[PDB]
């Protein structure tokens with residue numbers, strides 16, 4: 546049995562003018578030595594904050610917790626699909642002191658590929674999609690790590 550731990554930059558974009566929002570992603574994958582089928586869990590977090598000249602301030606945070614099956618195609622490539630929950634927390638302050646916060650969970654799902662350019666190294670690329678209330682958040686991920 547082996548495990549693969551990867552991490553890297555994540556970047557979210559929602560339909561509706563909610564520009565790019567940067568963060569990170571971590572995945573923990575587990576494989577058995579004698580089956581191509583394993584499991585992978587994924588943690589994603591992005592955020593963006595903005596303060597206008599008017600004094601107004603906005604802060605958006607996105608969390609995605611997903612997991613699913615991972616299939617090893619050959620020695621250097623595997624594919625995976627994940628499902629779970631997405632959480633969005635949106636903070637807004639109308640200067641000087643009017644605040645309004647909203648948060649809610651939604652379904653999240655994703656798919657990715659992991660390459661092993663050397664047996665102990667992993668290059669991970671995935672996309673994650675969540676629907677929180679009516680906003681659709683899409684997040685691209687590129688990570689790296691070790692298999693051990």
Ligand SMILES: CCCCCCCCOCCOCCOCCOCCO
Pocket residue numbers: 579580581582614615616624625626656657
């Ligand atoms: C979106 C990407 C694809 C989603 C990955 C789904 C991968 C699920 O597995 C598909 C293949 O089925 C697995 C085989 O388990 C049997 C192996 O042999 C067992 C030991 O004797």
